[PDB]
Design a protein around this nucleic acid. Structure first.
Length: 119
DNA sequence: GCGCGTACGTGCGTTTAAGCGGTGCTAGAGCTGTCTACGACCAATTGAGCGGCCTCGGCACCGGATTCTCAGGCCTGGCTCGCGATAGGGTCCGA
């Protein structure tokens, strides 16, 4: 796939899938309990590109075993909570050989991260 | 909680040794008659050994080096980033 994926998780939510073209960001709650992700921050790093910061609404909770996918403006997807959300303020999550998607909670702590590395 | 890859579960054909039966006997477990060395027990011995005192000394306890260990900072090598060269692809042009 030419993009190595590094998965690390210390909480309940893991970064399930990252789009190489930056169309969407997919996270998974692999525990057996619902995770409240109110005002959690998603920071996307594309190599040396400036950070794109996405902020969730003040009250948001992902049910256990459910999938929420954050789509970009250029993707053309339709938001449908609690499973589908679209970030119209950003045309695309970006591209590059070093794509890093870090999930930041409301306390500014990194609990999940997945990095796409291409030789 | 993330992964994996290799070690164990599942399956199944194979056989080969487990299980079944049946035999003979004699090795040895068991039982009975004898008596003979084995052990108990009591009187005296007596001295073996137990019970309180003197010492002295192995050992304990306090003070301060001495060697040790623990902890933290700066320098050098391992490492890496990067420009420009001679080998390979390819061309022809002789006959």
């Amino acid at each position: 796939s030419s993009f190595s994926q590094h998965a690390r998780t210390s909480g309940r939510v893991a970064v399930e899938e990252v789009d190489e073209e930056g169309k969407f960001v997919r996270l998974r709650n692999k525990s057996n309990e619902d995770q409240s992700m109110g005002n959690w921050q998603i920071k996307r790093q594309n190599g040396d590109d400036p950070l794109l910061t996405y902020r969730f609404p003040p009250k948001f909770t992902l049910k256990a075993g459910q999938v929420v996918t954050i789509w970009a403006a250029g993707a053309g997807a339709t938001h449908s909570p609690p499973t589908d959300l679209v970030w119209k303020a950003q045309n695309t999550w970006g591209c590059g050989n070093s794509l890093r998607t870090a999930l930041i909670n409301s306390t500014g702590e990194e609990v999940a991260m997945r990095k796409l590395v291409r030789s």
